[PDB]
Amino acid sequence: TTSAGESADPVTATVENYGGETQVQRRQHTDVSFILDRFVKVTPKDQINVLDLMQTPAHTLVGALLRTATYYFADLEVAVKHEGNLTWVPNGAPETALDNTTNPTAYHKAPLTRLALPYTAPHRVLATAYNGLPTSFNYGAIKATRVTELLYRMKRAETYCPRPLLAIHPSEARHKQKIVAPVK
């Protein structure tokens, strides 16, 4: 299939150009809302954990596929292992508001605490890259006596204006791994 390659219109070619037939596709694993709706762990601080999604590592699945977008919308789901009582404050709250139990405070029950947090930012969408370290937009903050594990989960995820993904660069021709297989 010849075309004007500089016009940047999307041009796809099929196998039917040389006598094949294009088959059916199931793309339910590469859609945005499905693939981002899973927990990813971040390294927590000792007490105060500002909840923004740039604490996710960039080499993880949710981190890299999150940083694929320029803009995003999500509600948040957090699962915290903590000592004492976990306290959440929304976006724009002072840090002394983290010392009050009238703010949403989940008392300790073993082994962890799983709670749903809404979108509390004053912006219509958030950003992965801000021209202007982006602006102080986040999902509030939590604190306990100590926080040992902190998980995020993006739900109702929407993404806008895609940005590059980079795979690992091999030293030889192919990047080889040890794919799991039985010994015998």
Binding site: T2, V32, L36, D37, D75, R156
Partner: protein
């Protein structure tokens, strides 16, 4: 919509489970991918 697979409706209302959307007054790359030129440009012989 996402990674949810329960068939029983939720115990909590929609006002307390999620943030509610507001109207004013997928989705571009679906139309940009569907508008891809798929055939041939010249005159196909044989």
């Amino acid at each position: 919509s996402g990674n949810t697979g329960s068939i029983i409706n939720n115990y909590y209302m929609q006002q307390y489970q999620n943030s509610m959307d507001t109207q004013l007054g997928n989705d571009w790359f679906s139309k940009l991918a569907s508008s891809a030129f798929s055939g041939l440009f010249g005159a196909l012989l044989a």
